[PDB]
């Protein structure tokens, strides 16, 4: 879908508001937690793994956060 | 007022040796330039045109499918033929169905099929490209004075509106009373418009980037296409079913004019309409001072009374606007006008509207003035009859300071090293920081390019712990600067 | 529930296609062969398809001389006849038959279509 | 799930999950629907003028995020050509013809 | 057999009647009739005012704009009762007798 | 948009075919091939910064792919 | 460039609606206020409203029985008056002026839409 690739990073923002600024700038804040609420099995064991895997306290957190974060944008 | 009222307003101070001062003009922010002995005027884009578009490609936003057709060649025979795979209208798909002595053929198993559907286009989302030389801009230079001028019939008379093209690079604007204003701008480094894009999709035009514009997934046309009907890509806006592996169909995907506005966050529209025209971005100018000239000079001082016709307001630029009156003769005089103390001992405002005047016996002249913080009187007029108001500014000086920080580095945000020369005069200082800003914005630029704002924020935050947590006092120091500012601009950018 | 298309009259050395119409249920679960009675002859068969599957046969006579095709978005079946010459004078008929490689009762025709290969 | 021409079978949670303005389904009027700010855009550009105007078809984007469910037929009654049935057989009263 | 509906997601509206009303600066939000409305879409936001707009006190005044929505396409997503659904399965006795 | 929510982890997935799901399966990892084409600048600061959290070389790699999956479905 | 309605007959008690057609030029750069005139009576300003701004202000003398509104979509604005009465038998006319709070010009003026109160 073109809705997959949008216009955000392209370094030609300015002063003027953008297309959808104001919609888009929680939304996928928004659908990571309405999946996280939707799936909290998968948390337990993206929480679970990054703790095995990560050594220290912020490696742990790093790994739990991308996982979550990877988890929704890849389906 | 038009430069009054507008939330983004900037002042700006001073001109260098050769009396000229660079600013960079915004589309919705409106520059102020004083100088001592100089008049103040009022700078305004607000107009970006680009003409003579071509189109670099067009894609397909809705299409319709005709003409479904099969061909099979059954188990170990080769692969189906159809005449429209010849054509290249049509889209093809190739599989395979479950064939026996029930489906038609003499062997059981897997046949080749082959479908083929004629692919035509109903929308389309064509993408223009302007040369940087055909990139009008207009400025409307208004002398801030205190006289306005009513909508309609100004023609020239205050408030002169220049057009800027990289065909000439001096722009001269002849604002009466005052002299004549040399702009001298940089039209050609504004907006890069070589790796820009006007899309224009069915009544709404974006500014995209022009790599992002040619990585779109629809079908698409060269854009020097005449014939309209070999789109290629095709395969993105149509899907081919083979359920169960008995029989292949082909549908359409759906409208995606939805799907284009949600790709199209974090472009800024644009109008496409009649013109091309651009209503964002910023221009780059030099301003020449050198034959500019205050209305008022060789004036009398007005000796008669002064009256406020409309009370003080204070606007959000921390200034306030003073609508007087005069009543008095020798009506071509200058006003006395100063901001003093509670004890009127020493002079603690100054002018934003440098030099008033008193033009005829009964127009309201309404003079833009910067008080102190605290209380302050405005003392309009000669001892006679000298008008006594006194002013209380809300703010504090640590506040305001703090606050022109923040401006500055939003601007920095929003321009690049092009913030560097908003006010600049020569400047060795300025010259070093635009260098090293334009090194630094291209390391930063490579490594952001295609990132959201939370995904800046996350690496900032890793950033600012690795430094915390990193031995070296140098490497701390800078992964922590380097964490700060990419936060900030997390937080900053997406607007 | 098959309806060929009208009265075609060509001239030699020409190519003629043919019409056959099926409905919905035709279309998707038999197939349909196309057999042309010359002017005071027999019948002939000329080919088939199965239309949901496309892949058309032709009898060894008709090698390189017919093409059969089936418009699965109209559910229409064509033939296009190349070399139209003098013994290619007949009638042609478009018959739903099962879609098995083993049973050819033709239990619907449809009303067969003049190719009348001459000047009137 | 039917859309204009083409229906499939979806989850409910994820069907009342879409981020796309509804209505109850007992409506006949329709002139409630819930989220109206998803298909819209209100724009202020700069801080001058403001606008609103609609998002356009989300046809397209619905078929996006549809991959991965099954596609059904609604046309003529609800026919469901996908999914699994467990019986159990009982041969009992079965014999062999022409034994 | 026998689908109820449960929702009626829209994939295509229009905005046909645009209100707008806006505050002065220090005089609070605006408000509109329409706000009140089901079948409007409405927001709030900031301009800015002044002696040239018309407002007399030079601030950011409140502004709400208001338009009519309506669908133009929406999908159904109806629902079965587990009790109406109807299983058809076919038992062939896979002689070598032709079907 | 609704796209960002493409009914994929969903169950209920028989053993016909699904919709578009040819394309889907390797869509999102062709998108993610064409943003590292296109901004390698981010990669290679990805590399670095899992490089300099990752203790052992697992979680070097992991971290990597965690981020240079984000960073283009982030948005 | 402003076009207004016809001219129409209430009653005593009902209300009547006026509109006016700004080109959109006139919309989005100008303001336009009401103004009615009695038959054998001076002007009289009703109110007046920034379309692209929508709030509108009122005569105090009408303030309570007059609304003025706009419409975005079609670049028009409307006068709507209630509780009509003999004497508000009056020639009612829109003009465009400058947004800005000091400049009370009016160029451009409305035909004038004659609203009568009567039975006959
Ligand atoms: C497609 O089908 C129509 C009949 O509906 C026919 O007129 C047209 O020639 C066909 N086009 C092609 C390329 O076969
Ligand atoms: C929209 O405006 C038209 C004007 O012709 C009016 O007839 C209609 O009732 C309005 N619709 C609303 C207010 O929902």
């Known amino acids: 879908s073109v809705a997959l690739v949008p216009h955000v990073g392209m370094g030609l923002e300015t002063r003027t508001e953008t297309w959808m600024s104001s919609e888009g700038a929680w939304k996928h804040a928004q659908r990571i937690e309405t999946w996280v609420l939707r799936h909290p099995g998968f948390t337990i064991m993206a929480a679970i793994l990054a703790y095995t895997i990560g050594t220290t306290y912020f490696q742990r957190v790093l790994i739990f956060i991308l996982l979550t974060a990877v988890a929704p944008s890849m389906t | 007022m038009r430069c009054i009222g507008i939330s983004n307003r900037d002042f700006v101070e001073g001109v260098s040796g050769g009396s000229w001062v660079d600013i960079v003009l915004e589309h919705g922010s409106c520059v102020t330039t004083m100088a001592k002995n100089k008049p103040t005027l009022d700078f305004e884009l607000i107009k970006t045109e680009a003409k003579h578009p071509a189109t670099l490609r067009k894609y397909c936003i809705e299409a319709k499918l005709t003409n479904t057709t099969t061909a099979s060649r059954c188990p170990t025979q080769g692969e189906p033929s159809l005449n429209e795979e010849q054509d290249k209208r049509f889209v093809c798909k190739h599989s395979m169905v479950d064939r026996g002595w029930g489906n038609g053929c003499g062997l059981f198993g897997k046949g080749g099929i082959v479908t083929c559907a004629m692919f035509t286009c109903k929308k389309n989302m064509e993408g223009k490209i302007v040369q940087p030389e055909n990139l009008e801009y207009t400025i409307v230079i208004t002398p801030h004075s205190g006289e306005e001028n009513a909508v309609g019939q100004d023609t020239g008379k205050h408030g002169k509106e220049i057009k800027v093209t990289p065909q000439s690079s001096i722009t001269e604007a002849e604002l009466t009373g005052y002299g004549t204003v040399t702009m001298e701008c940089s039209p050609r480094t504004g907006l890069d418009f070589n790796e820009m894009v006007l899309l224009q999709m069915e009544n709404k035009a974006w500014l995209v980037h022009r790599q992002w514009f040619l990585d779109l997934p629809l079908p698409w046309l060269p854009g020097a296409d005449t014939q309209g009907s070999n789109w290629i890509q095709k395969e993105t806006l149509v899907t081919f079913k083979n359920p169960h592996a008995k029989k292949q169909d082909v549908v359409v995907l759906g409208s995606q004019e939805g799907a284009m506005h949600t790709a199209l966050t974090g472009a800024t529209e644009i109008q496409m309409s009649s013109g091309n025209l651009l209503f964002t971005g910023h221009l780059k100018c030099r301003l020449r001072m050198d034959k500019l000239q205050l209305k008022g000079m060789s004036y009398s001082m007005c000796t008669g009374k002064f009256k406020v016709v409309k009370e003080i307001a204070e606007t959000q630029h921390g200034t306030i606007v003073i609508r007087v009156q005069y009543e008095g003769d020798g009506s071509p005089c200058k006003i006395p006008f100063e901001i003093m103390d509670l004890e009127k001992r020493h002079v603690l405002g100054r002018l934003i509207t440098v030099n008033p005047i008193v033009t005829e016996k009964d127009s309201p002249v309404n003079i833009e003035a910067e008080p102190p913080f605290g209380d302050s009187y405005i003392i309009i007029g000669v001892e006679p009859g000298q008008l006594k108001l006194s002013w209380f500014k809300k703010g504090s000086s640590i506040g305001q300071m703090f606050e022109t920080t923040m401006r500055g580095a939003k601007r920095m945000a929003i321009l690049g090293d092009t913030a560097w020369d908003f006010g600049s005069l020569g400047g060795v200082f300025t010259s070093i920081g635009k260098a090293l800003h334009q090194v630094f914005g291209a390391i930063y630029g490579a490594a952001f390019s295609g990132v959201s704002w939370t995904m800046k924020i996350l690496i900032g935050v890793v950033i600012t712990w690795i430094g915390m947590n990193s031995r070296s006092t140098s490497l701390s120091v800078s992964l922590v600067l380097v964490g700060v500012v990419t936060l900030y601009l997390g937080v900053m950018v997406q607007a | 529930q098959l309806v060929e298309s009208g009265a075609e009259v060509k001239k030699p050395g020409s190519s003629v296609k043919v019409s056959c119409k099926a409905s919905?249920?035709?279309?998707?679960?038999?197939?349909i062969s196309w057999v042309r009675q010359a002017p005071g002859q027999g019948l002939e068969w000329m080919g088939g398809?199965?239309?949901?599957?496309?892949?058309?046969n032709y009898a060894q006579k008709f090698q390189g001389r017919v093409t059969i095709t089936a418009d699965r978005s109209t559910s229409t079946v064509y033939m296009e006849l190349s070399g139209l010459r003098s013994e290619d004078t007949a009638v042609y008929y478009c018959?739903?038959?099962?879609?098995?490689?083993?049973?050819?009762?033709?239990?619907?025709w449809g009303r067969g279509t003049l190719v009348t290969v001459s000047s009137a | 799930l039917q859309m204009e021409n083409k229906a499939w079978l979806v989850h409910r949670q994820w069907f009342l999950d879409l981020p796309l303005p509804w209505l109850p389904g007992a409506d006949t009027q329709g002139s409630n629907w819930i989220q109206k700010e998803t298909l819209v855009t209100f724009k202020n550009p700069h801080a001058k003028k403001q606008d609103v105007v609609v998002l356009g078809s989300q046809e397209g984007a619905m078929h996006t995020a549809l991959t991965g469910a099954t596609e059904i037929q609604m046309s003529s009654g609800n026919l469901l050509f996908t999914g699994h049935l467990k019986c159990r057989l009982r041969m009992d009263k079965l014999q062999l013809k022409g034994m | 057999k026998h689908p109820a509906t449960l929702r009626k997601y829209c994939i295509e509206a229009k905005l046909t009647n645009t209100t707008t009303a806006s505050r002065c600066p220090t005089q609070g939000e605006p408000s509109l009739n329409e706000e009140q409305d089901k079948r409007f879409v409405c927001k709030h936001s900031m301009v800015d005012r002044g002696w040239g707009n018309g407002c007399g006190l030079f601030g950011k005044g409140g502004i709400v704009t208001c338009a009519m929505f309506t669908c133009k396409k929406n999908m159904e997503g109806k629902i079965v009762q587990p009790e109406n659904l109807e299983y058809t399965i076919v038992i062939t006795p896979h002689s070598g007798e032709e079907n | 948009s609704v796209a960002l929510v493409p009914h994929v982890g969903m169950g209920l997935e028989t053993r016909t075919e699904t919709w578009m799901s040819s394309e889907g399966a390797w869509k999102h990892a062709q998108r993610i091939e064409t943003w590292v084409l296109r901004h390698p600048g981010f990669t290679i600061m990805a590399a670095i910064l899992a490089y300099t959290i990752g203790t052992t070389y697992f979680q070097r790699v992991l971290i990597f792919i965690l981020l240079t999956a984000v960073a283009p479905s982030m948005t | 460039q402003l076009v207004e309605s016809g001219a129409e007959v209430k009653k005593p008690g009902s209300s009547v609606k006026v509109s006016c057609?700004?080109?959109?030029?006139?919309?989005?750069?100008?303001?336009?206020?009401?103004v009615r005139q009695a038959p054998g009576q001076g002007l009289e300003w009703?109110?007046?409203?920034?379309?692209?701004?929508?709030?509108?202000?009122?005569?105090q003398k009408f303030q309570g029985r007059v609304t003025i509104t706009a419409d975005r979509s079609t670049s028009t604005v409307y006068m709507e008056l209630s509780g009509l009465r003999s004497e508000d038998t009056a020639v009612?006319?829109?003009?465009?002026?400058?947004?800005?709070?000091?400049?009370?010009?009016?160029?451009?003026?409305?035909?004038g839409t004659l609203v009568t109160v009567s039975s006959a």
């Open positions: 018959a739903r038959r099962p879609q098995s490689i083993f049973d050819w009762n033709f239990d619907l």
């Open positions: 919905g249920g035709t279309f998707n679960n038999y197939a």
């Open positions: 398809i199965i239309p949901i599957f496309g892949g058309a």
